[PDB]
Curated annotation (Swiss-Prot):
Key words of the record: Acetylation, Cell membrane, Cytoplasm, Disease variant, Lyase, Membrane, Metal-binding, Osteopetrosis, Phosphoprotein, Zinc
Organism this protein belongs to: Homo sapiens (Human)
Cofactor, how bound (note): Zinc. Can also use cobalt(II) with lower efficiency, but not copper(II), nickel(II) and manganese(II).
Disulfide bridges in this chain: none
Involved in the binding of some activators, including histamine and L-histidine, annotated site positions: 90
Functional description taken from the UniProt entry: Catalyzes the reversible hydration of carbon dioxide. Can also hydrate cyanamide to urea. Stimulates the chloride-bicarbonate exchange activity of SLC26A6. Essential for bone resorption and osteoclast differentiation. Involved in the regulation of fluid secretion into the anterior chamber of the eye. Contributes to intracellular pH regulation in the duodenal upper villous epithelium during proton-coupled peptide absorption.
Name of the protein in question: Carbonic anhydrase 2
Gene that encodes the chain: CA2
């Protein structure tokens, strides 16, 4: 028995095991485009993924991760509202059971079909485990997915999902270039947030891109065939693994564009 996205262990139940769920800087949040403030001080994002080394793709039960080698500054994120170098460690998605829902962040209450999260940690802290204990430990790039034209760079991920259908399954996933998942523009909003899953730690500096990237209905359909359960257990489709928007409270969302 543990947390999940069901009716008896869903987001509304998390606070019982993780009190920080009712914290002051929880994520996700609704981005009100007319309240976000343009900040001329914000610098352009610097994404250097040319030397990225993907290693494996694993079904964690609540989502699947595509892990990268973070033993050196191979794939890093710099600039923007960040101070220092952040290394990419893994990326994952959250999606819905229908095309009208699935994203965690919303824009003027608009929900997208899915949301991609590219997780990076601040190298000044040594390792990921130490970074999550700091207020500026992580820097997560969020990208919205809308249903429309297929995204070529995502097909490689889609085709291997059959091999990691159930919880605990993993597969080698080398030579995947994350640059194929980025939109044309890097304009973004940013705000201080948390992880969206337990342990819900408030160590994130969120960088949500304005431009969504289009994927086909066929591609998203395959995400919906994954299982929350482990092999040999009752089947429960991995869908709607998103947390609803939380109170913004004492925070301001800044935009890199006007
Ligand atoms: Zn996420």
């Amino acid at each position: 028995h543990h947390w999940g996205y069901g009716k008896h262990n869903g987001p509304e139940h998390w606070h019982k095991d993780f009190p920080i769920a009712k914290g002051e800087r929880q994520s996700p949040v609704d981005i009100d485009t007319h309240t976000a403030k343009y900040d001329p001080s914000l610098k352009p994002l610097s994404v250097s993924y040319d030397q990225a080394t993907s290693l494996r793709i694993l079904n964690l039960g609540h989502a699947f991760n595509v892990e990268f080698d973070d033993s050196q500054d191979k794939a890093v994120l710099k600039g923007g509202p960040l101070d220092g170098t952040y290394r990419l460690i893994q990326f994952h998605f959250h999606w819905g059971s229908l095309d009208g829902q699935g994203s965690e962040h919303t824009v003027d209450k608009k929900k997208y079909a899915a949301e991609l999260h590219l997780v990076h940690w601040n190298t000044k802290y040594g390792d990921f485990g130490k970074a999550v204990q700091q207020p500026d430990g992580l820097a997560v790039l969020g990208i919205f997915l809308k249903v429309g034209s297929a995204k070529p760079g995502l097909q490689k991920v889609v085709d291997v999902l059959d091999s990691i259908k159930t919880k605990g399954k993993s597969a080698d996933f080398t030579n995947f270039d994350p640059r194929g998942l980025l939109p044309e523009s890097l304009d973004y909003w940013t705000y201080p947030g948390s992880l969206t899953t337990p342990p819900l730690l408030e160590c994130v500096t969120w960088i949500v891109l304005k431009e969504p990237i289009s994927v086909s209905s066929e591609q998203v359909l395959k995400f919906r065939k994954l299982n929350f359960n482990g092999e040999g257990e009752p089947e429960e489709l991995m869908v709607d693994n998103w947390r609803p928007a939380q109170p913004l409270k004492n925070r301001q969302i800044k935009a890199s564009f006007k």
